UniProtKB/Swiss-Prot annotation, chain B:
Forms part of 2 intersubunit bridges in the assembled ribosome. Upon binding to MALSU1 intersubunit bridge formation is blocked, preventing ribosome formation and repressing translation. This is Large ribosomal subunit protein uL14m. Keywords: Mitochondrion, Ribonucleoprotein, Ribosomal protein, Transit peptide. GO terms for cellular component: mitochondrial inner membrane; mitochondrial large ribosomal subunit; mitochondrion. It is found in: Mitochondrion. One of its GO terms (molecular function) is RNA binding. The chain holds residues 31 to 145 of 145 of the full protein.
Swiss-Prot record, chain E:
InterPro entries: Complex1_LYR_dom (IPR008011), Complex1_LYR_MIEF1-MP (IPR045300). Keywords: Mitochondrion, Ribosome biogenesis, Translation regulation. Belongs to the complex I LYR family. Disulfide bonds: none annotated. Signal peptide: none annotated. The LYR motif mediates interaction with NDUFAB1 and is required for the function in mitochondrial fission. GO terms for molecular function: mitochondrial large ribosomal subunit binding. It holds the Pfam family Complex1_LYR. It comes from Homo sapiens. Interacts with intermediates of the mitochondrial ribosome large subunit (mt-LSU) (via MALSU1 as part of a complex that also contains NDUFAB1); regulates mitochondrial ribosomes assembly. Interacts with MRPL4. Interacts with MRPS27. This is Mitochondrial ribosome and complex I assembly factor AltMIEF1. It is found in: Mitochondrion matrix. Assembly factor involved in the biogenesis of the mitochondrial-specific ribosomes (mitoribosomes). Specifically associates with intermediates of the mitochondrial ribosome large subunit (mt-LSU) and is required for proper ribosome assembly, possibly preventing premature association of the large and small ribosomal subunits. Thereby, indirectly regulates mitochondrial translation. It is also required for complete assembly of the mitochondrial respiratory chain complex I. May also function in DNM1L-mediated mitochondrial fission.
UniProtKB/Swiss-Prot annotation, chain F:
The modification N6-acetyllysine is found at K15. This is Acyl carrier protein, mitochondrial. GO terms for molecular function: acyl binding; acyl carrier activity; calcium ion binding; fatty acid binding; mitochondrial large ribosomal subunit binding; structural molecule activity. It comes from Homo sapiens (Human). Carrier of the growing fatty acid chain in fatty acid biosynthesis. Accessory and non-catalytic subunit of the mitochondrial membrane respiratory chain NADH dehydrogenase (Complex I), which functions in the transfer of electrons from NADH to the respiratory chain. Accessory protein, of the core iron-sulfur cluster (ISC) assembly complex, that regulates, in association with LYRM4, the stability and the cysteine desulfurase activity of NFS1 and participates in the [2Fe-2S] clusters assembly on the scaffolding protein ISCU.
From Swiss-Prot, chain G:
It comes from the Eukaryota. It comes from Homo sapiens (Human). It is found in: Mitochondrion. It is linked to Combined oxidative phosphorylation deficiency 9: A mitochondrial disease characterized by failure to thrive, poor feeding, hypertrophic cardiomyopathy, hepatomegaly, and psychomotor retardation. Death in infancy has been observed in some cases. Belongs to the universal ribosomal protein uL3 family. The gene is MRPL3. This is Large ribosomal subunit protein uL3m. The chain holds residues 262 to 348 of 348 of the full protein. Component of the mitochondrial large ribosomal subunit (mt-LSU). Mature mammalian 55S mitochondrial ribosomes consist of a small (28S) and a large (39S) subunit. The 28S small subunit contains a 12S ribosomal RNA (12S mt-rRNA) and 30 different proteins. The 39S large subunit contains a 16S rRNA (16S mt-rRNA), a copy of mitochondrial valine transfer RNA (mt-tRNA(Val)), which plays an integral structural role, and 52 different proteins.
Amino acid sequence: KFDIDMMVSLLRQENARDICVIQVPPEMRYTDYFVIVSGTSTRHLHAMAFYVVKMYKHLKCKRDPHVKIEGKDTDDWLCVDFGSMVIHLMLPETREIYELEKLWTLRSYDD
Amino acid sequence: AIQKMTRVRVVDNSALGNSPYHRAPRCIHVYKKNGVGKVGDQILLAIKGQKKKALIVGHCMPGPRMTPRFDSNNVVLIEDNGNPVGTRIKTPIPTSLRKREGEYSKVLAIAQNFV
Amino acid sequence: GTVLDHLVGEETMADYLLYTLNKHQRFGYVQHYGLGSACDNVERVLKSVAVKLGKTQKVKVLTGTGNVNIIQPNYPAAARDFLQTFRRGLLGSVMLDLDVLRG
Amino acid sequence: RFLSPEFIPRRGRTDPLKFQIERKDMLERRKVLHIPEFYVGSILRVTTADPYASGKISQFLGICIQRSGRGLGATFILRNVIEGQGVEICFELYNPRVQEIQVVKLEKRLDDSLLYLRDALPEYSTFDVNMKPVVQEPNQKVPVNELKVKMKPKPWSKRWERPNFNIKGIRFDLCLTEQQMKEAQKWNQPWLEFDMMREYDTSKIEAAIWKEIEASK
Amino acid sequence: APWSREAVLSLYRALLRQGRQLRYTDRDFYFASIRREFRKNQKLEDAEARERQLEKGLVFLNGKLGRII
Amino acid sequence: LTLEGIQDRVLYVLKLYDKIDPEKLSVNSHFMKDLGLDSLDQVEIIMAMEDEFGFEIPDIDAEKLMCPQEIVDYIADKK
Amino acid sequence: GNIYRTEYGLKVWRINTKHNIIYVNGSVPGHKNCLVKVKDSKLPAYKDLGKNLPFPTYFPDGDEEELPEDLYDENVCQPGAPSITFA
Ligand SMILES: [Mg+2]
C-alpha cells in the first residue's frame, strides 16, 4: 500500500535535502498527510515526482483514481495529488517565501 | 457567473492585492468556450493597468446544491506558470476544487479555511 | 497630453508626476498644493488635494459580505486636477529627459 | 403539532399517487437520522460527508433563511458571514450524505423568508461557530424575537420596500425616507389579501399526511 | 519582559523533547527550523507581541492544528 | 562509573559543537562573557548532553550549570 | 409541440412492483399523466445486452423467486440504508 512509511524509503533514496511530513487534523479537510519536500535543482524535482508515480503504477491501487502532475511549466513549485497524501516539491529559496510548514501546523497563528 | 468586466475581489496577501484608489479589479477574459465562468475557471484580470491571469474560487451565482454561494465574487491570483501570487489566504475556500481539472493543488495549500 | 487619459489611466499618470517632481529636486507643487510638507505616495497626495478642493465620490466597494457604497475622496477627480495644473504651468518648468540625461 | 412543509403537496395537477410514492421514500430516510422541527428563524448545525475529500465530515452552522422546495428534494439554505465573508450553502434535506442535523436555537422570525439578510447588516447575521445549543423547553410556544434589522443604503439586492414581498423584519423608518415610502405603496395591490382562489386552502390535506406519518411507526 | 521568562526556556525544551521521537520528518532540519523561529523573532520586539509569540508555540505544543510526523 | 569518564565524554560532544571555542574553554568557564551564550542557548548545551547521556535531567537544575566543573560534579551523583 | 418525439438511452434505476413504477433516468417527452411508449433501447452499445431480461414478457405466474417491493440498481442509495461515508 502507498502509505507514509515508504515515502521515507523513496525520498531518502534520491538524497532529498529536506523532508517535512505533517499529520493534519481530521477536522481540517484536505487530506490525511501533507508532504513538503525540497530539491537541489528544478531538474531534480521533475524526475523525483516522475519516479513517485512509477512506484504507484506497479503497487496497484486499482479502484483509486489516477495521478495528475501539476506545475509542469513552472520551476519553483511541483505538486502531485493523491487520495491520502499530497506531496509538494519546492526549491530551498521557495521554501522560505511561502513558509508552507507553519501553515498546516498552525492554521491561524502565523504571518 | 463571471463574464468580461465583472467586478471581483482578490483574496490574497499580495502587495498587489491591497490596491488603493480604484479598489475594484476588472477582468477582461474568461478561459472557457463560453463567457460563463464557474468555480475553478481561469480568467484574466486588469489590475492597476497590468493584465494578470486569475482563478475563480466561488461566485455569487447559484450553482449546484451543496456548494457555497459566496456573497462576493472572490477570485485568487496566479501567474502564467500556475502558482499563486500570495503567501496566505484568509477567506473561506470551498473544497470543490480538488476533483476538478487544473493546477488547484497549488491553491489549496494556501487556504487557511475550508468552508 | 498627446493621448487621452483613459487608455493609460489617470492615477497611472498621477504617480509619474511624483516621480518627476520629487527625484528631480523640483518640489514645485507645494506652494499651490502644499499638503503638509511633501509626499511621494500617490495615495496620500490624492487625499489632501481632495480635501482642499472638496471632492466627493460614491463608489461600490466590494467587501466579502456584499456590495456596499462608501463615500470616498474623488481619486479620479484628484488625479484630473493634479494633471491640469501640470499642463497649465502652475507646477514648475520641468525636463522629462533627466533619466536619459544621466550620462 | 408541526407538520413539515415538504410533506404538503403543492397545488397542482400531479397525480396523488406520485406524492404517495414520494412520502414512502421520505419516511424511510427519516428512520436513519432524526429531522427536528426547524423553522425559518432556526439556527442549524448540519454535518455532511462529501466525495471531494477523503471521507471526512463537514460541520456548517447557519440561519435557515429559506425553506422552500416541495418534495423529496426539499432544500434549506444556511448563512454565515464567518471571517467577514458570506457563505451560502443550500442543503438538500433527503440527500444521503447528511449524518445528523440539530438545532442550536429553535426560534422563528416574523417573516416566512429571511432572504433580506443579504441586504441587512452583517452584525444581524453572524453566528458563533463554536457556540453551545440553547436549553429547550418541552411544551411551550416557539420563541418569536422581533429583531427587525437595519440595512445598508438604498441599492439593495431586491426591492424589499415593495409590499409584494410583505417583509415584516426591517426597521424601515430610519433607513428610508417618506416620499419613497409613498411611491412603494403605489404597488399595494390590495385585492390579493382579500382573494379566495389564489389562497390555497390546505387544512384537509394535512389529515391524510398525518394519517400517513403515524401509520409508518 | 515576556509572560514568563522561564516559559520561554520550557517551551524550547518541550518542543525538542517532542522532536527526539521524530522518525519520518528529518531531525536535522527540525532543530534548525526551531532555532530560526526563535533567534530571529524573540530578541527585540514590542510589548504585546511577546505575549502573542509565546502563546503561538503553546498551540504548536498541543498539536491540535496539526502535528509533524 | 568513573569520574574521569565524565570529563572526556561531556566535553567531547561540546568539542563537536561548533559555537563554543577551545580558546576560552577552561575548567571554570563563565557562560555569559567567557563563552558568549544566550538564554535558550543554555538549553542547547543541555540538549547536547541529554541526547547522549542522562534522560532524567529536570528543568530548574539545568539552569545553574554555569561552568564545566559543575556539569561533571552535579551529574556524577546523578548516576 | 404536440409531435411524437423519442428520447434515447434512458437507464432504469429502480422498479416498484407493487404500484407498477418504472424509474427512468432523465426527462420523458410529454406532460404529466400522459401515455408513453416504453421500448428497449436502439443504441448499438445498449441494445445487445439483453441476456438476463425476461424474454417474452415477465410472468408473475411462474412463482419462482417472487420479486420484492422494490428492485434496485447497484449504484443507487437505498432509502433505509445509512449515511454514505466515502472513506
Ligand atoms: Mg440583483
